[PDB]
Amino acid sequence: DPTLEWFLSHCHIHKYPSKSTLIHQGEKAETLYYIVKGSVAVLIKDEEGKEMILSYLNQGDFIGELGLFEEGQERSAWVRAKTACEVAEISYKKFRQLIQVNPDILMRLSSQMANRLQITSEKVGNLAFLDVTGRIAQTLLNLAKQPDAMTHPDGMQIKITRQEIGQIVGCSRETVGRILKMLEDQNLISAHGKTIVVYG
Amino acid sequence: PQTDPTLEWFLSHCHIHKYPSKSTLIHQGEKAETLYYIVKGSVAVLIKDEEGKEMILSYLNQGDFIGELGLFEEGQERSAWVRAKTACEVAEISYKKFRQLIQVNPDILMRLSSQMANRLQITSEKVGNLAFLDVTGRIAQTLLNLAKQPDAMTHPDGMQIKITRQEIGQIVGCSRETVGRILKMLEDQNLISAHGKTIVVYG
Numbered sequence: 001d002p003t004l005e006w007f008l009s010h011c012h013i014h015k016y017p018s019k020s021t022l023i024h025q026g027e028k029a030e031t032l033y034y035i036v037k038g039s040v041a042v043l044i045k046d047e048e049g050k051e052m053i054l055s056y057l058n059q060g061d062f063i064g065e066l067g068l069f070e071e072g073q074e075r076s077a078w079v080r081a082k083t084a085c086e087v088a089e090i091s092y093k094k095f096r097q098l099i100q101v102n103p104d105i106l107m108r109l110s111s112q113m114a115n116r117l118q119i120t121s122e123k124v125g126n127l128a129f130l131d132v133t134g135r136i137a138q139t140l141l142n143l144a145k146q147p148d149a150m151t152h153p154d155g156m157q158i159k160i161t162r163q164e165i166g167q168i169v170g171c172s173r174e175t176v177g178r179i180l181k182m183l184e185d186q187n188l189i190s191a192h193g194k195t196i197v198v199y200g
Numbered sequence: 201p202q203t204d205p206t207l208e209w210f211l212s213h214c215h216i217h218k219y220p221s222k223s224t225l226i227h228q229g230e231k232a233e234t235l236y237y238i239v240k241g242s243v244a245v246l247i248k249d250e251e252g253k254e255m256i257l258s259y260l261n262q263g264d265f266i267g268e269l270g271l272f273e274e275g276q277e278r279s280a281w282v283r284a285k286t287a288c289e290v291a292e293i294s295y296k297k298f299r300q301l302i303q304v305n306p307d308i309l310m311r312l313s314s315q316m317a318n319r320l321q322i323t324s325e326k327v328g329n330l331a332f333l334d335v336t337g338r339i340a341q342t343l344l345n346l347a348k349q350p351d352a353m354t355h356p357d358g359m360q361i362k363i364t365r366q367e368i369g370q371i372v373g374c375s376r377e378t379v380g381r382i383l384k385m386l387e388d389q390n391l392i393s394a395h396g397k398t399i400v401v402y403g
C-alpha cells in the first residue's frame with residue numbers, strides 16, 4: 001500500500017541481532033520504530049526485576065509510539081528482540097512532519113494503539129478478580145480453545161512451558177509447577193514435559 | 201480543564217448533549233459510529249470478567265475523548281460500557297465527520313492519539329500491578345490513584361476521597377468484603393481514616 005511505502009522511504013532501516021534490547025524502560029523517547037522483519041517482546045518488571053509480557057509484536061507493528069505525543073516522555077516498557085530484527089527508525093520530529101503531510105500514517109499507528117488498548121484492557125478484566133490458581137486455569141482453558149490447539153486422546157493438547165505460563169499470569173516458574181500438579185490431581189489437566197492436556 | 205484553539209475548533213463541529221448521572225453513554229458490543237468528548241463531568245468505563253463481574257477499567261473526566269477505539273477500522277464494536285458518574289455535558293460527532301476534520305487539521309487526531317497512548321500506559325501499569333502487587337498493595341495503589349482524581353478534596357491530614365467500598369473492589373478486582381478487611385487493616389496501620397462514605401489518604 002502506498003502510505004506504508006511513503007512512510008518507509010523516510011525511515012532508516014537497521015538490523016539488530018537476536019536478544020538485542022531495542023528499547024529500555026525509563027529512557028528518553030525521541031524515536032519511532034516499525035518492524036520490517038522479526039519479532040519482539042514487550043516486557044515490564046517488578047522491584048526484584050521479575051517479569052510480565054505485555055505483548056509480542058511482529059512484522060508490521062510500530063514500536064516506541066507512546067512517547068510521540070508529549071514532550072519529555074520516557075519509555076513505558078522494555079522491548080527486546082526475540083529474533084534477528086529489521087527495524088525502520090524515524091525521529092519523532094520528522095514523523096510529526098509526515099503527519100501534517102498525510103495523517104493516514106497516524107491513523108495506521110493509532111489503529112495499532114487502539115487494538116493494543118483493547119487487548120490489554122481485556123487482560124485486566126480476565127485476570128483481576130482471580131488468584132494465581134484461577135489465572136493459571138483460565139490461561140490453559142483459553143489456550144485449549146485456540147485454533148493451534150491439537151487433538152489428544154485425553155482432550156485438547158497445548159504447547160506451553162511453565163516459564164511462559166508464569167510470564168502470562170505474572171508468577172514464578174515454581175508456583176506454576178505446584179499449581180499444575182494440583183490441577184492434575186483435581187482431574188482437569190495432564191502435564192507432560194512442554195505440553196499440557198486440558199480435559200474435555 | 202484546559203481547552204485550546206484546536207479543541208474549540210473541533211467543538212464548534214460537534215453537538216453538545218447532557219447526560220444525567222447513571223445514564224449510559226455507550227453499551228459494550230454496539231456498532232460504533234460516534235466520537236465523544238467530555239466538556240463537563242465524569243464517566244466510568246466498565247468491562248466484565250468471565251464470570252460477569254463488573255470492573256471499573258477507568259474513570260474519564262472533562263477533556264477526555266470517549267468512543268475513539270471504533271474509529272480506525274470498519275465495523276468495530278464498542279469495547280466497554282461507559283456510564284455517567286456525575287451529570288455530564290458531552291460533545292458528539294460522527295466518525296464520518298471526524299475523519300474529514302482530521303484532513304482539515306491533523307492536530308485534532310494528535311490530541312486524540314495522545315490520550316490513547318496515555319491510556320495504554322495506565323492500563324499496562326494496572327495489568328502489571330495485578331501480578332506484581334498483593335491485594336493489599338493493589339488497594340493501597342488505587343487509593344493513591346483516587347487521591348489524584350479531580351474530585352479529590354484537600355484535608356489537613358492529606359487528600360480526602362469519596363468512594364464506596366463496592367467501587368474500590370470494582371477498580372481493584374476484589375470483593376467488597378475484602379476491601380472492608382483491608383481498609384480496616386490500613387486504618388489500624390495509621391495510613392488512612394474511614395469516616396463513613398469518606399476516606400482520608402494520609403500524605
Ligand SMILES: Nc1ncnc2c1ncn2[C@@H]1O[C@@H]2COP(=O)(O)O[C@H]2[C@H]1O
Nearest residue numbers: 055063064065066067075076077116120
Ligand atoms: N500493553 C502494550 N501492548 C503492546 N505494546 C506495548 C504495550 N505497552 C507498551 N508497549 C510498547 O512498548 C513500547 C515501550 O516504549 P514506548 O513507551 O515509547 O512505546 C511502547 C509501545 O510501543
Ligand SMILES: Nc1ncnc2c1ncn2[C@@H]1O[C@@H]2COP(=O)(O)O[C@H]2[C@H]1O
Nearest residue numbers: 121258266267268269270278279280323
Ligand atoms: N483501558 C481504557 N482506559 C480508558 N478508556 C477506555 C479503556 N478501554 C476502553 N475505553 C473507552 O471506552 C470506550 C468504549 O467504546 P469504544 O471501544 O468505542 O472506545 C472506548 C474508550 O473510549
Ligand SMILES: [Cl-]
Nearest residue numbers: 225226227230
Ligand atoms: Cl452504545
Ligand SMILES: [Cl-]
Nearest residue numbers: 333334335336
Ligand atoms: Cl493476593
Ligand SMILES: [Cl-]
Nearest residue numbers: 363364365397
Ligand atoms: Cl462504603
